[PDB]
């Protein structure tokens, strides 16, 4: 090699080995002798571990073969590149946009934050015990503080992933490349004072170009980003630094068009993947975002997380976990923070209740009956795991239910053997609600194929019937207890002063003070649950009717229409409903019940008799959609009004906007089902009349502004 | 075009090299020699190639499929399709479908209870092939692949 150091280094490459012997000739001779299929390895060693291996001289698998431009190859961190103000502001700008790409865009740490040569230089000094001195204040002080503040944010992210709240290298990548800063990294106050000192330098600085104004906001943004650890260490609920982060990011977004930024070449590169220890294949650097809109998303997502602290009942925390991450997937930082903010270190929920007391509130508000048991201890753990599953990504969210359904079922059956009716009832509600949620979530993930829509929509309709039946019986008992208390009041007006009246007034006043308020609240909550579950039940029945109409014309079937030679329709069906196979109540209907129910829905007639039954099915879809729209409108009304109007209790005080937004999209999807039903009819009737008929297929289409638990079964021409 | 389907010959070096080069270009996830070595040396009966008899080099395989089988849990044998690729100039001729048929038929004769594979949700060509054979989607994996795309886990139940 031409470089002197490489020449001098090659002399002492193998100096730690006193005597080396060429065994290349011996290896070749023995390997030629061996059979082509044989592999020499430790018999205990598993060959599956070899699949995780990198390969030399493999462009996809070799980090060393990465190609670098001249500017990237050297780039001494000590050189102050001209112009200093424009370059420092451009370096600091790209670093922030590297963090957004890492967290918001789920990109890898080495190709984002560690891609900067400055951050590598700083962390290497921290591993030992600023890291570079350039002679220029902007790079030495203003830029040195920016790198320190970002490296501090990464360490805080490591503390979050250490909790195992979210899955690593899926929701968030933390490939530290072997870095361990230990306790050497300074404290939050020191990092903040460094950034604050740099801001004061800029105010005194003479150059008044737009780059200075943007560099001030970049220092301010890092300051407000460092304050993110305040919500975990101190459980801060103050939106002061989250609002400053939003105001700072708004000011920079209007600054990007007025000026063009280009950092010194070689500042951000794949250099670190080439000359630092790396057990992973090389990776290109994905295009960074053009604006700071990620910090606004992150700041808004964290503000939402802190709102759960303001909850005053179990139902308010329950609906928060049900709506804060339902419409779209929240920022990974916010998703990790919620269980850590909810389930605190002191083994308390939000610092207010213990794990068992928090569980008892859910049973109390659901049953309206006043309550170190091992079943209570286990159910409490199960409830917290249910809360933590709500903050998982849209795919893991469904997979979490696959594990809960059998533990809820086992727990319920354990409550049943001891004849604990209240806890068995509540567990049944969580188990059955999860089965419906688990099933319907598959449509949002396009899990089921169009031929499977009937099986799943009718099964949910089957489940929704059982849940409505259960909730209605619960509400009748609740109303029964209310009427009993109302009966004591009537019995007191017709009574005269006496010993027997004093016993009744004492009984009545006890029930009004300790029971009536909860009875009314639980009843009104069950009223909302009944409207919520009938919207589910109706929508499912609309989907089944739509499917049945499609099969009536011969356009779809509840089995795979393509001929296969290895499986049958029953085996495929049992595999689809495998998760619900071991659950006893409600039992999974047999394969025969699925087949017979569909044949009842399918219009077997032809001609004018067909027209009457077809109009009957379409008339139901159009009328039920309007019924669904009215139920959603009534729910949306109660949400706007609150939980003190006397009819509906929704517990949506903390997620009011999200809940109305959810039901709005649910209303959009409902109207789409009615419109689609009419298009399908006018098309198929005309297609049958025409002797040349298009070949149609059905696809599960998602409404752009609707709820994709109920996709639109849409006709489409095959063509070529 | 005269497509011939035959099992992999473990002693042949060119078949091994052609399979790897074929799979490396067409598949996005990178594989080392020992990925192929784990499949081919332990399940040599579960890899099939498609060659063109009328081609300029009839020995070179234009399509291949790489599979394996292991007990899943304790009571079931789970066949697994690791790689499947067909040359760009040979696609649209039913070659991949035949390779998947002969391999699943092989795994079924070996008393597999199910077949499993992972494919990209954006890979419509592969989804149509398997779902057309009875495969259904049992799982969606968030950003499963190196290219950050989601994956579907497809399972075909045989018993």
């Amino acid at each position: 090699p031409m470089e002197v150091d490489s020449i001098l280094g090659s002399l002492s490459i193998t100096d730690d080995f006193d005597q080396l012997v060429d065994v290349t000739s011996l290896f070749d001779e023995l390997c030629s002798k061996l059979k082509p299929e044989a592999i020499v390895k430790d018999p205990r060693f598993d060959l599956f571990e070899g699949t995780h291996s990198l390969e030399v001289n493999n462009s996809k698998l070799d980090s060393s073969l990465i190609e670098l431009t001249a500017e990237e190859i050297e780039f001494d961190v000590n050189v102050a590149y001209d112009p200093p103000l424009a370059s420092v502001a451009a370096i600091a700008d790209r670093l922030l946009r590297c963090v957004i790409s890492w967290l918001n865009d789920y990109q890898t740490l080495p190709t984002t934050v560690l891609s900067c040569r400055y951050t590598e230089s700083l962390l290497s000094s921290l591993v030992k015990g600023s890291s570079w001195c350039t002679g220029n204040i902007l790079y030495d002080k203003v830029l040195g503080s920016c790198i320190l503040g970002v490296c501090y944010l990464t360490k805080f992210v490591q503390k979050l992933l250490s909790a195992g709240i979210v899955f690593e290298e899926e929701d968030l990548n933390f490939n530290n490349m072997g870095f361990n800063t230990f306790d050497n990294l300074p404290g939050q106050d020191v990092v903040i004072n460094s950034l604050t000192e740099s801001l004061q330098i800029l105010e005194a600085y003479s150059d008044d170009s737009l780059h200075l104004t943007m560099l001030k906001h970049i220092l301010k943004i890092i300051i407000c980003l460092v304050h993110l650890e305040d919500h975990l260490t101190d459980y801060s609920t103050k939106t002061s630094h989250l609002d400053e982060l939003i105001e700072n990011a708004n000011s920079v977004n209007g600054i990007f068009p007025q000026l063009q930024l280009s950092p010194p070449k070689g500042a951000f590169s794949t250099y670190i993947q080439k000359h630092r220890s790396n057990q992973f294949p090389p990776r290109k650097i994905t295009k960074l975002p053009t604006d700071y809109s990620g910090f606004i998303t992150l700041a808004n997502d964290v503000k939402t997380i802190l709102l759960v602290d303001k909850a005053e009942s179990a139902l308010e925390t329950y609906q928060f976990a049900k709506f804060f991450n339902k419409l779209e997937q929240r920022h990974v930082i916010a998703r990790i923070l919620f269980p850590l903010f909810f389930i605190r270190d002191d083994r308390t929920v939000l610092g207010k209740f213990s794990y068992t007391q928090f569980y008892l509130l859910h049973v109390k508000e659901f049953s309206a009956q006043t309550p170190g048991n091992e079943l209570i201890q286990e159910s409490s753990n199960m409830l917290l795991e249910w809360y933590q599953n709500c903050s998982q990504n849209t795919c893991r969210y469904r997979q979490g239910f696959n594990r809960q359904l059998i533990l809820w079922d086992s727990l319920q059956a354990q409550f049943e053997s001891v004849n604990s009716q209240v806890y068995c009832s509540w567990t049944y509600f969580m188990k059955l609600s999860s089965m419906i949620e688990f099933s319907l979530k598959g449509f949002d993930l396009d899990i089921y194929k169009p031929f499977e829509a009937y099986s799943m929509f009718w099964y949910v309709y089957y489940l929704s019937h059982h849940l409505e039946t259960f909730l209605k019986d619960s509400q009748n008992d609740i109303e029964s207890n209310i009427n009993a208390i109302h009966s004591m009041n009537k019995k007191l007006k017709k009574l005269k002063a006496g010993e027997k009246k004093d016993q009744l007034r004492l009984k009545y006043r006890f029930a009004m003070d300790n029971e009536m308020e909860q009875l009314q609240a639980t009843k009104q909550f069950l009223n909302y649950l009944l409207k919520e579950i009938n919207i589910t039940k109706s929508l499912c029945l609309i989907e089944v009717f739509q499917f049945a109409i499609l099969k009536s014309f011969g356009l779809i079937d509840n089995k795979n229409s393509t001929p296969s030679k290895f499986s049958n329709e029953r085996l495929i069906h049992n595999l689809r409903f495998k998760p619900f196979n071991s659950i006893g109540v409600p039992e999974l209907p047999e394969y025969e019940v699925f087949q017979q129910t569909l044949k009842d829905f399918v219009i077997e007639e032809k001609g004018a008799a067909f027209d009457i039954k077809l109009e009957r099915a379409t008339n139901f879809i159009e009328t039920e959609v309007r019924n669904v729209v009215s139920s959603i409108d009534e729910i949306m009304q109660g949400i706007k009004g609150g939980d003190n109007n006397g009819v509906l209790v929704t517990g949506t005080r903390l997620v009011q906007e999200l809940s109305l937004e959810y039901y709005c999209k649910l209303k959009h999807t409902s109207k789409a089902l009615s419109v689609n039903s009419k298009v399908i009819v006018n098309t198929l009737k005309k297609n049958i009349k025409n002797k040349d008929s298009h070949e149609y297929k059905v696809e599960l289409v998602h409404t752009t502004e609707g709820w994709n638990y109920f996709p639109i079964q849409t006709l489409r021409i095959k063509q070529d | 075009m005269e497509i011939v389907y035959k099992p992999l010959d473990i002693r042949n070096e060119e078949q091994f090299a052609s399979i790897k080069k074929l799979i490396d270009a067409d598949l996005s996830e990178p594989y080392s020699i020992y990925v192929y070595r784990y499949f081919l040396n332990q399940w040599p009966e579960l890899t099939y190639i498609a060659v063109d008899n009328k081609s300029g080099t009839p020995n070179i395989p234009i399509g291949c499929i790489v599979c394996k089988m292991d007990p899943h849990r304790n009571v079931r044998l789970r066949g697994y399709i690791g790689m499947l690729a067909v040359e760009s100039t040979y696609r649209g001729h039913g070659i991949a479908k035949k390779l998947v048929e002969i391999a699943i038929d092989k795994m079924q004769r070996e008393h597999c209870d199910e077949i499993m594979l992972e494919t990209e949700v954006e890979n419509s060509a592969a989804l149509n092939l398997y779902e057309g054979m009875g495969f259904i989607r049992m799982k969606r994996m968030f950003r499963y692949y190196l290219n950050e795309g989601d994956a579907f886990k497809l399972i075909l139940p045989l018993t």
């Binding site: 992973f280 | 996830e29 990178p30 992972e118 692949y145 190196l146």
Partner: peptide
């Protein structure tokens, strides 16, 4: 398609 994992 089998996925690579470290």
């Amino acid at each position: 398609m089998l996925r690579f994992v470290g």
